[PDB]
Symmetry: D2
Subunit: 466 residues, 4 copies
């Protein structure tokens, strides 16, 4: 079916799957830092907690880290913990050494979330310029600002940035959202600051400016994932262009099989209102239609007054979108963008998803220790939940950004090695049952290795749940 | 190309066509009723002015009617004039006779744009019920409210409604937006109230509730077009379901070849802010990707403080979306949903668009007196402007809701009959030149009749602009 | 790609694939019965040997069976042995001199009087159809010899005999086949002679039957009864040589193990041009159904006497492969021809050419799209293995199959590489000779053990692929069998590197 | 739909379309030269008559031209008259008795000594190739008679003669064609004899040339020179009968008006199985290019002597249509056969069957998708007319064409209805006989006027469609010509109801 024919035949009043495939990121703040509120977030459907290191002492974030782990352990929940960097930020005389030998007479310097426009006339000396206020406004201390024109000469990883990432490694974060990534080598610089000790931590590059967009191929190649950081992006490039940026980045990550997060103002009005606007409901649903793994929440939960409800909405919208998607068409078009010949693992994951569609399997079970194979299954967009039986707790938590996945922990030190995969496969099936995805009689597709092969999955299996 | 492959290859930094295909509806109010402001709307890119008869005296709207015609004639602009009915509205004790024998103990009565929830417990007598306030609030006089559960026993066309439509016929409106259309026969009732004198006026049914959605096939069959009225819709059915409603209605109208308008809160935050939110930019762009002819503005221009700017944004977003669309894929999937055999006119319009793509024509020119053939060309979604040379001024104004069309008036009483079509064809070409769409050398596709045939187009032509 | 775009990009002077997927069925006869001639056909490309029980005694066919088995053993070949039944078939008797010549305008007497079986002349000769004079009325047609001889019926002479008018020149040979198309032929689906042939076939351990003139599912049912419990594992391939066969194709495929498009008779029973369409229907339907199909009769006709085929013959063969036939067949050409070996070599050369001219991934997908969801686990697994073959450009696909059920279900999805089938039944090796792409190797379980592991059969298969020159250490294979728990069907797919 | 899904839904006992789109080319010979026999072929289905200038004198062909013109006039038929050149062709001389018989093992002497032209024997005979002994060295092969006779060269005897070893039984007839595939043949692209033939053809007003052995665009260029200014409107159809022809197909199509897949020789010059692929390349490329293509040689071979074809012959013909050929051809079968009329009737019956088995909308779209954008206005218009045909299930498509350029460009897009071409040139009527779907009617402008309106030619076309039984009042047609202003090409499409 074409998109057109598909749309014409959508049911609207028949009920839907309740197994929500997409993942919701939440930013923690005053509204949501208490343990009790973190529990509400988890219950309401958060999978990842975002610490925004553009604000607050190491000590402030320590509280977040503590309260979360308290909430998550209490509820038995796996929750990605993410550290979002300050980056080469610019706040306010304004904080930017090379400001004058960097910005042209004629260009633009927007301030305070893009609201205040200013045009440059000439250079006064080595410090500042004299400019032209294009619309009136009032202007707090310490407000963020963009230089759409010039490419900024601040470092990808500042000194504060080293101290933050170091603190992050020490607290065992699961992933990094690196603000303002412009190139592949900047990604490499984040990788370095993390060092040997932080080498198993996911870097999600935030694309926030012109150059990030231009270098997307390279950044994707070097990162574990992308965030479409639309706040800054919408100020750095014309507002309407962001729509195209979002489509490009989401689809390229989809082809690359790397998680991608859509961010910023998705349900903005819910910062203060019980109900979202019509535009906002549609934004969330369309980020899912674009192929986004994750949709994110910022102000809405950091400092909003409806943090449970806003997440509940987000979850409800994702479910609806998910059910209005022709998922087999997604699977297929992704398959078609892959080079032949595939590696054996990739052909296996691709083919397992094929089987899922062929037998209408109710669950897909994959053994992954690093998450590689989980992400490789999810890359192919099956219409069912992916159970991942994993030996690492870090993997459970990192897999919270990947569409469709519920991770289950096999404690190998306690229960044995499981060379023949039987204990892990059993653990996965029980998980699928416990969660209501399957019952005896249903078909499952299972992915792992045969007896000989080590270091990747090379086998698919179709089994009947007992 | 798949959607996926398409998205991966979008340019973002190359420039685009500036011939905007989609149309922008504006609601007139305190911010926009003066002649000078109406001129700004026209300049900023309004094509249709919406009078909201849910508020204001006949005398208030008379001002609007006058100021508009003053602005439009001054600027030489063609502007659809639309009358949006009060309908079976409910404001506030609440205004609804059969309220108690109509609503169940257990159902819901939301009030004031969906904000205030109330659950029904039992029946007191023949007047009112006693209910349960689910969230606190403050509650002005005269606030609109919905009954999601029951199907309302108010008339499709009330008495006020007759007086309004009668006033509308007398003022020569171009089209009607009928609130709360639930069935085909309700459409028929609007048609009756309009009478013989109003028989050439377009009825655009507003879909705003459960039943409208269920009966869409029938309503489309009976109407000239649809509006996705998402304000009321988002309160009558679960918020997230509107996303699906929008997709169904837009595509069905697209298959039916009838104009469709997407409405309500598209750039809401711009009621007060100079910049739209990220969610709002995306809403507008996605309504264009859905296949909407028109996107609409309500509060944003009725009572907003940035009415020019908000329209300018809307126009800029439409252009971007339009340019990121695979328009040939749209053309094709529409063609494929039509029954064989087509009528000759339809095969002609379909085929002209085919030629447009084949020779990359820069303009498509069609002679239509009623608009039939204009709408029939636009149905097939060419990637160029459609010039329509028409003999009726009412047609120019009604064609303002149809994608891609610029209408040009041939004054037949003044200039002659033009049986061989030469004067009208010349008029159309000059129009395309005047507007910068073509220059000598370019190819145009032209649609009208051969010398013999009367009452529809049966001929296509490919010509070189001199 | 579309068919058009595909064609304009075909190469003609580039190398082609070396591994022939289609299979060749050879009819045995004077030219071909000796052990030596059999070795000849095997080396030349024969996968299947067809005994035509329309000629010869049981003893005659015993010679064929013995010689075939001796030649196959010398060469270490699996060769399917097929018994093609007489059916409800009307043949002529014998002619004085072993031949008679007929001229347009002439009359002749056609009789069912058995007295005249041996002594056919210009003036009277015998056809074996006792109810001739009741069945074919004046103004009817009797066709003879692949329908090349046209006779019109003038009158009934007596209880035995019709007077006929000769329409065209022909030289008539002993015991030709006749067609009465405008007619209800009063004849058993399975005659007494047929039951004996079949029973004989069962004792002699044939692999498959080619059942002539199959009209209905019920008749397939009859042949199945006739093989009995003892013969239950023998494949039945139904021959579609008439109107009703084509009409009832869906049911005949249901009941059957396979289909032969028997074009000789079919081209006389129905207008000649409609054979083209029936050929396309039967092949594609067998493909969709996953049952082997064979295209037969006159494919390389002129090589009965000539060391090279006509241009028409060559494209007939290629198009049969393009249509999607598993097998193409020979008749005249191997039974009594002058070039039994070269005609086979030509057929195999034409198959390979067409094979490599095919867009095989598109075949595969076509077939997939025509199957109901949900699939059985077996079918998803096989379908998906083949999917994996294309994704990794695998050099061979190995499937463990005892019945052959799983091998046929793999081959169903039309991979573009050899399929190895490790089988624990010798008979299955031989029955898989009519299935595109399959090479079978035998695993002697009695002599080597249960192999619940599957390792021994997997190794055997890999080694078979190596011996055949399909793979070397480093190459990817796709392997299909069951996990440790599941019995009765495959539920597992592995992609391995060849050690 | 996919090819598979299409097939499984083909019907075989449902009615078929009645309006034959493909065209039949008949070679004239003894069997067919009389006026009466010509009327015979015309009524039977011949659209084109091929003179083979490899046999017969100018006077002989004059008889053919005259008889054809007399028969076409009696019947009011447009028949394309084609001159098929000798080319750089090597034929044998004459044999005593008009035939000789050769046995495997034998030697024979093959000589280029003209003394031996008339007197060929078992022991020595003549082939017309003066440079024989230089060109074909020991251990080479000489093939004769559609490459059925195989001789190996042993030694050179003298300046004229080679000793050869006979590979197989054959009965050799006077003046057969020879192939030296392993060889540079020292022969003119256009001999002196050729220039005269062509010049003769030009005076006699032939419609088209079938140019033998065309190797390069330059050689097409040579034939064009040879026709001169006077012959500039004659169509050149290049025959691809060798390696270089296939190799240089893209350039030969550029230079040519069309292509014949001449399979007789081609099947000897290149491995027999590769003809299948060359056939698919040439046809599809001509389709993409919008130039007519003909498939030739041995299509219905056995009907030279038999009143019905073989199963192979029938599918050869159908598959040529499926491939997308405009025309299929006859040779032996009409020139010297016993059933000139029935062989044509069979061919037309097979064409129609295959035509109706085709998914014609899919042909059309394939071809569209293979064209560069932007198209010329002409091409968009024609492409879009055909588009309209499918959309309204039109009963006929009318196009005004004087050169035939626009008719060929309409037919290019493979509508599934008759195309009427109103033309002001009698020659165009006759040249359009090799273009699928076209029926031409003649508009006598000198006698009826300028018709800048187009009304007179539009009416003429509609009336032609009525006479032919394609349309009645009420039916939809699609009509293609120019608006009032544009000259030199069509830029306009109309859908009308037939009054
Ligand atoms: O952790 P990743 O890289 O996803 O790989 C996991 C895969 O490797 C294997 C084989 O080595 O792991 P395991 O050894 O835990 O059984 C597969 O069974 C499993 O699917
Ligand atoms: O006004 P609608 O119904 O679109 O029909 C207009 C069509 O009818 C015709 C023919 O009657 O109008 P007109 O008579 O003005 O020339 C066509 O030329 C024209 O395209
Ligand atoms: O014999 P068929 O029906 O083809 O099925 C064979 C399949 O069954 C299984 C399991 O029963 O056989 P086996 O037990 O011989 O190993 C699979 O391994 C094998 O692929
Ligand atoms: O002769 P060709 O090149 O086919 O083109 C003929 C076309 O040119 C035109 C216009 O020149 O011919 P005509 O002037 O004879 O009417 C079209 O009407 C006609 O369809
Ligand atoms: O960093 C962000 O999330 C942004 O600016 O959108
Ligand atoms: O009527 C409307 O426009 C609405 O409620 O959305
Ligand atoms: O028996 C056959 O094979 C036939 O009739 O073609
Ligand atoms: O000349 C021919 O037609 C041939 O060689 O096939
Ligand atoms: K940050
Ligand atoms: K209203
Ligand atoms: K038989
Ligand atoms: K010739
Ligand atoms: Mg940012
Ligand atoms: Mg409303
Ligand atoms: Mg038979
Ligand atoms: Mg030749």
């Amino acid at each position: 079916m074409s998109q057109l024919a598909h749309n014409v035949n959508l049911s609207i009043f028949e009920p839907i799957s309740h197994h929500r495939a997409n993942r919701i990121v939440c930013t923690i703040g005053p509204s949501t830092q208490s343990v009790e509120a973190l529990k509400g977030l988890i219950r309401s459907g958060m999978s990842v907690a975002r610490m925004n290191f553009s604000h607050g002492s190491h000590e402030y974030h320590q509280t977040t880290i503590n309260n979360l782990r308290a909430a998550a352990t209490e509820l038995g929940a796996h929750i990605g913990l993410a550290l979002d960097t300050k980056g080469p930020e610019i706040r306010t005389y304004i904080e930017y050494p090379r400001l004058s030998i960097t910005v042209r007479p004629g260009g633009f310097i927007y301030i305070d979330d893009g609201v205040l426009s200013l045009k440059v006339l000439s250079k006064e000396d080595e410090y500042t310029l004299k400019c032209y206020v294009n619309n009136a406004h009032f202007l707090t201390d310490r407000k963020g600002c963009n230089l759409p024109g010039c490419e900024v000469d601040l470092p990808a990883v500042s000194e504060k940035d080293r101290e933050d990432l170091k603190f992050g490694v020490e607290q065992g974060i699961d992933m990094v959202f690196a603000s303002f990534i412009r190139t592949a080598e900047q990604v490499q610089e984040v990788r370095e600051a993390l060092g040997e000790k932080g080498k198993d931590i996911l870097i999600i590059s935030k694309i926030e400016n012109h150059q990030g967009v231009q270098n997307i191929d390279g950044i994707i190649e070097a990162s574990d994932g992308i965030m479409v950081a639309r706040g800054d992006l919408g100020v750095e490039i014309p507002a309407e262009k962001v729509v195209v940026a979002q489509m490009i980045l989401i689809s390229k990550c989809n082809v690359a099989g790397k998680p991608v997060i859509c961010a910023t103002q998705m349900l903005e009005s819910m910062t203060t209102n019980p109900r979202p606007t019509r535009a906002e409901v549609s934004d969330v649903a369309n980020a899912v239609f674009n192929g986004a793994d994750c949709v994110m929440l910022s102000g809405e939960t950091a400092k909003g007054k409806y943090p449970n409800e806003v997440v509940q909405y987000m979850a409800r919208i994702c479910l609806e979108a998910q059910s209005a998607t022709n998922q087999a068409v997604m699977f297929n078009s992704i398959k078609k963008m892959q080079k032949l010949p595939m590696s054996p693992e990739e052909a296996v994951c691709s083919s397992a998803v094929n089987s899922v569609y062929e037998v209408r399997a109710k669950a897909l079970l994959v053994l992954s220790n690093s998450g590689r194979s989980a992400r490789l299954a999810s890359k192919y967009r099956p219409d069912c939940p992916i159970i991942c039986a994993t030996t690492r707790m870090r993997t459970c938590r990192q897999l919270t950004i990947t569409r469709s996945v519920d991770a289950v922990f096999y404690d190998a030190e306690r229960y044995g090695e499981d060379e023949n995969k039987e204990k892990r496969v059993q653990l996965g099936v029980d998980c699928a049952k416990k969660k209501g995805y399957v019952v005896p009689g249903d078909l499952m597709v299972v992915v792992h290795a045969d007896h000989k092969v080590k270091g990747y999955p090379n086998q698919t299996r179709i089994i009947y749940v007992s």
